[PDB]
């Protein structure tokens, strides 16, 4: 019985600096560790095998090291192409991977652009309407979205989704969808979306009538 634990869960590194990922095996396994890179929507790509051997095509910036129980994957001069999830794998007949480490680049604080979309007219015929609030291009990963219908807070009736870190400007986008019934949508007037973010001195509210 051998476990491999990765740390940290998320790693934030400035552009050009060094990223150091840790992989701890519960028992001494010499050099039997393999590192993999996996970007969202893509297959895993082999980076290191046997603790310190680079796979063909892997640049010198990435290099694995360590023997025994603790192992490290180092990414020198971090590039926007390095934002991914990295897995370490115990090289055994009963294989086992680590939980994975997400790596993102550090960026200047970017305020989000808040858009709100009233539901189309063909939605009300279906009996369910969905109003969408968009938070576009902000670097501080987490924000606070609040839905208010005629001043009444209605956040627990919505669902959120965040895209990956953009490869060009290194920001995040968030989209919240408040789903209500048509018979409830026609019984209220103002629908507001309140956004709290580090790049905002005060909460930004976007609303509409009808």
């Amino acid at each position: 019985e051998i476990m491999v634990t990765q740390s940290p869960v998320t790693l934030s590194v400035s552009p050009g600096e060094r990223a150091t990922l840790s992989c701890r095996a519960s028992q001494s396994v010499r050099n039997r560790i393999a590192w993999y890179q996996q970007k969202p929507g893509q297959s895993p790509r082999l980076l290191i095998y046997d603790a310190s051997i680079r796979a063909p095509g892997i640049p010198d910036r990435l290099s694995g090291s360590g023997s025994g129980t603790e192992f490290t994957l180092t990414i020198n001069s971090l590039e926007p192409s390095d934002v991914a999830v990295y897995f370490c794998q115990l090289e055994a007949n009963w294989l086992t991977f680590g939980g994975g480490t997400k790596v993102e680049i550090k960026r200047a604080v970017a305020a989000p652009s808040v858009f709100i979309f009233p539901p189309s007219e063909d939605q009300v015929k279906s009996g369910t309407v969905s109003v969408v609030c968009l938070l576009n291009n902000f670097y501080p990963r987490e924000a606070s979205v609040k839905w208010k219908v005629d001043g009444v807070l209605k956040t627990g009736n919505s669902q959120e989704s965040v895209t990956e870190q953009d490869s060009k400007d290194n920001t995040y986008s968030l989209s919240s969808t408040l789903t209500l019934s048509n018979t409830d949508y026609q019984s209220h007037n103002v629908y507001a979306c309140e956004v709290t973010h580090q790049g905002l001195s005060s909460p930004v509210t976007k609303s509409f009538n009808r």
Binding site: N31, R32, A34, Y36, Q38, S43, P44, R45, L46, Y49, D50, I53, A55, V85, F87, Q89, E91, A92, N93, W94, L95, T96, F97, G98, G99, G100, S113, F115, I116, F117, P118, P119, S120, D122, Q123, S126, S130, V132, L134, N136, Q159, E160, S161, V162, T163, S173, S175, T177, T179, F208
Partner: protein, 218 residues
């Protein structure tokens, strides 16, 4: 110099047998050291399933699912298949097949992975999505989008202007609504001065339901 391609059903009813085939191209399957299956559950990393060794045919599988999994190999088709039985909803994941390499040590590691195939385990039926346009209320940048509501199962493809528009596009990952159906958004930021001189359509494609719809957004 080796390409792997997973094949099989994208939706499987519970308690049934999931059968996934890994077609290998480039080399002979028996020219490889070993082959393996690894899946990616939602909210989880890579979890190894099985591994078959070429020279002997011996199989190693995860103990938490030993009696439920087998692997067959067809050298004529140059492929090997994974069979998971008594499939529960816990088995919904993105299943990969990969080639193993023992190096000098003989301990396995994967060097070539397949595209990956998403398999959803549910008794729900296949359902096509409803596509509604997303436009701001009736200022140097406008946000246009499409809402792809109530479809099952994953995934769906959304492009803008038949792939001609890529900059400023953000297709959000889908959200599993409490109804058992998915819904995602796909937005794009464009100059406000171009809204009158530029058409923006979203190309939604849901292969499980054989649905294809292009929506003009204004």
């Amino acid at each position: 110099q080796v390409q792997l391609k997973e094949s099989g059903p994208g939706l499987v009813r519970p308690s049934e047998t999931l059968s996934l085939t890994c077609a290998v191209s480039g080399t002979s399957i028996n020219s490889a050291y070993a082959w393996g299956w690894v899946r990616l559950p939602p909210g989880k990393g890579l979890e190894w399933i099985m591994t078959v060794y070429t020279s002997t045919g011996n199989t190693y599988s995860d103990p938490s699912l030993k009696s439920r999994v087998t692997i067959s190999k067809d050298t004529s088709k140059n492929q090997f298949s994974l069979r998971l039985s008594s499939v529960t909803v816990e088995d919904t994941a993105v299943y990969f097949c990969a080639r193993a390499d023992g190096s000098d040590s003989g301990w396995p590691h994967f060097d070539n992975w397949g595209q990956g195939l998403l398999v959803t385990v549910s008794s729900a039926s296949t359902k096509g999505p409803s596509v509604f346009p997303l436009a701001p209320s009736s200022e140097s940048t406008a946000a246009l989008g499409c809402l792809v509501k109530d479809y099952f199962p994953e995934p769906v493809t959304v492009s803008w202007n038949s792939g001609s528009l890529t900059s400023g596009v953000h297709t959000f990952p889908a959200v599993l609504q409490s109804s058992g159906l998915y819904s995602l958004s796909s937005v794009v930021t464009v100059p406000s001065s171009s809204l009158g001189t530029q058409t923006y359509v979203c190309n939604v494609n849901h292969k499980p339901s054989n649905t294809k719809v292009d929506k003009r957004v204004e």
